[PDB]
Amino acid sequence: IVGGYTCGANTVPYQVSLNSGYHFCGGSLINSQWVVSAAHCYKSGIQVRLGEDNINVVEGNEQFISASKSIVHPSYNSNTLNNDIMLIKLKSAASLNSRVASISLPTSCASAGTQCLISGWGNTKSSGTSYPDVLKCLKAPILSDSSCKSAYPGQITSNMFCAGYLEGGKDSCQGDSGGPVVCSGKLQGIVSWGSGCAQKNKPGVYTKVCNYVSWIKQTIASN
Ligand SMILES: [NH3+]Cc1ccc(F)cc1
Ligand SMILES: [Ca+2]
């Protein structure tokens, strides 16, 4: 996250870190046995780390649970990033408390102008690199689809929205991939892609989770 603030330990209790020997992507706990993330984060051998603040220090609230099954959206296109969403089932159910909690799925799509919380352990610099050990947070609005399509000509599908600042300076970034965009207590987006980070007129692009609620529900009912 570029231009954000330190969230505070366990103040984003649905935030997960996906680990394959190191943190490589964020994700969101949607019930005690399922995580949603970005399909471009797919990897074999994923361990899900819950209750994390410092990802390099064991602090007492962590739950490390291995994935038993991963399901990439049946129409994911890695070239255009359309349908960049994946579900991960945990080997055993997470123990839920104030610090490890699931986030609700939306029953409505959120509108442009809605303020949201984006969070992750990704890069904090627009030019150059520096990865935080503790979770970072950013409040950003959803942008109109016409300014989103004007920023990314011929690249935005109906399964994507832009959120952030056309002025730049504040944005998600590499390593924040797969992580949550929560608006009014509901998961509305998944950190997906963009042109670099915190650049002028290149806001973040997010998977539109409200389009996928019935694929998610029927997939977790059957697996
Ligand atoms: N600035 C949006 C963005 C998000 C994630 C990423 F991996 C690269 C760019
Ligand atoms: Ca830790």
Tokens of 69: 């099954």
Residue 145 annotated to the active site: no
Residue with tokens 């207590």: 185
Measure 106 CA to ligand 2 centroid, in angstroms.
29
| Same domain assignment for residues 72 and 57 | yes
Please tell me the total count of domains within the chain: 2
CB 208 within 8 A of CB 161: yes
**Listed residue (72, 26, 31, 76) closest to 49, CA to CA:** 26
Residue 176 annotated to the active site: no
Least distant ligand from the CA of 178? 1
CB 188 within 8 A of CB 182: yes
Tokens of 27: 């994700």
| Same domain assignment for residues 75 and 108 | no
| Same domain assignment for residues 59 and 94 | yes
Residues with Cβ within 8 Å of 97's Cβ and at least 6 positions away in sequence, in order, are none
| Same domain assignment for residues 116 and 191 | yes
| Same domain assignment for residues 108 and 155 | yes
SS3 state of residue 76: coil
Residue 73 annotated to the active site: no
Separation between Cα atoms, residue 34 and residue 16, nearest integer Å: 11
Residue type, 137: C
Q: What is the CATH number of the domain that holds 122?
A: 2.40.10.10
SS3 state of residue 189: strand
Q: Are strands 186-193 and 180-183 parallel, antiparallel or unpaired?
A: antiparallel
Residue type, 120: G
| Same domain assignment for residues 140 and 205 | yes
Closest residue by Cα to atom 5, ligand 1, is 173
CB 4 within 8 A of CB 137: yes
Longest dimension (CA), the chain: 47
**Listed residue (114, 69, 112, 121) closest to 90, CA to CA:** 69
Q: What is the DSSP string of 36-103?
A: EE-GGG--SSPEEEES-SSTTS--S--EEEEEEEEEE-TT-BTTTTBT--EEEEESS----SSSS---
| Same domain assignment for residues 108 and 69 | no
| Same domain assignment for residues 8 and 39 | no
CB 67 within 8 A of CB 133: no
Tokens of 87: 């579900």
| Same domain assignment for residues 93 and 119 | no
| Same domain assignment for residues 120 and 203 | yes
Q: Judging by beta carbons within 10 Å of its beta carbon (0-12, 13-18, 19+), is residue 207 exposed, middle or buried?
A: buried
SS3 state of residue 212: helix
Tokens of 104: 């609700």
Residue type, 179: G
| Same domain assignment for residues 137 and 170 | yes
**Listed residue (24, 47, 16, 204) closest to 131, CA to CA:** 24
Q: Method of determination? A: X-ray
CB 58 within 8 A of CB 133: no
Q: What is the DSSP string of 133-152?
A: SS-EEEEEEBPPHHHHHHHS
Domain span at residue 32 reads: 13-102+211-223
**Resolution to 1 decimal place, in Å:** 1.8
CA distances from 97 to 11, 14, 18, 104, 136 (A): 12, 11, 20, 15, 21
| Same domain assignment for residues 36 and 77 | yes
Annotated binding site for Ca(2+): 52, 54, 57, 62
Separation between Cα atoms, residue 174 and residue 190, nearest integer Å: 13
In which order are the strands placed within the sheet that holds 5-6? 5-6, 136-141, 115-120, 180-183, 186-193, 204-208, 160-163
